[PDB]
């Protein structure tokens, strides 16, 4: 069974997610509006969407048990490299297989393959991204596993630039062990079949998605007129080599 610390960690991560993920998407009204007619007409809306999502990712990250014991530099490294990955992961909540799209409450805020294209990205990212979303959906994760996965994703010792790798590893292992134990104690067969390994694999998928996103973002942002359409937080986190 799950220890009291493990139950504690789960309760903390659930609450941290509830406080940083608004399932009514009510804040989407504050973003630059979506335009669907290239011009890259979806870049101002989606730039704001990602920018907003970074802030929420940070808010969640601060509440991860053990995260606060890291230096602020390492906090920075972990967030800079993981943010795109956790946005893709957390976006699974809005993703729907009915039509292979992210459904955020309304037609304006429903984003399909071509909306993402209209933000400067190609099928080289979008196709594996959608495939990720599908493979992830099909795990039918408990909300508890989802929040653990986002946490394990953030606290990853192999991230480039990490100083106190040992301490990051110890923090991850504690979450990892909470995940494995949660799966054995609270996820019934058959759904729990090789579930941990399938979740770790999704983190491997995210590393490729991350790399590909970095290449396309690099190319997108070099062009000063695209960079003009981004936010200052997106430039800071993803890069501003323009």
């Amino acid at each position: 069974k799950l220890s009291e610390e493990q139950q504690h960690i789960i309760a903390i991560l659930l609450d941290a997610h509830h406080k940083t993920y608004d399932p009514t998407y009510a804040d989407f009204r504050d973003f630059r509006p979506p335009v669907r007619m290239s011009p890259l007409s979806m870049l101002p809306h989606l730039a704001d969407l990602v920018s907003y999502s970074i802030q929420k990712v940070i808010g969640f990250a601060k509440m991860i048990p053990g995260f606060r014991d890291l230096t602020s530099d390492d906090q920075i490294v972990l967030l800079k490299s993981s943010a795109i990955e956790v946005i893709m992961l957390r976006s699974n909540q809005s993703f729907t297989m009915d039509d292979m799209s992210w459904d955020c409450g309304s037609q304006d805020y429903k984003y399909d393959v071509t909306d993402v294209s209209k933000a400067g990205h190609t099928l080289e990212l979008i196709e594996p991204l959608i495939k990720f979303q599908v493979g992830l959906k099909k795990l039918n994760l408990h909300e508890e596993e989802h929040v653990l996965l986002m946490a394990i994703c953030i606290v990853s010792p192999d991230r480039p630039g990490v100083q106190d790798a040992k301490l990051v590893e110890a923090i991850q292992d504690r979450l990892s062990n909470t995940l494995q134990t949660y799966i054995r104690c609270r996820h019934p067969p058959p759904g729990s079949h090789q579930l941990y390994a399938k979740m770790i694999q999704k983190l491997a998928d995210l590393r490729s998605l991350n790399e590909e996103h970095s290449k396309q973002y690099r190319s997108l942002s070099f062009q000063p007129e695209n960079s003009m359409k981004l936010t200052p937080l997106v430039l800071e986190v993803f890069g501003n080599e323009i």
Binding site: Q55, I58, K62, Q75, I76, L79, P232, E236, V237
Partner: peptide, 11 residues
């Protein structure tokens, strides 16, 4: 380096 906004949001 220089990540003032990320830093601020962190504490």
């Amino acid at each position: 380096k220089n990540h003032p906004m990320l830093m601020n949001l962190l504490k």
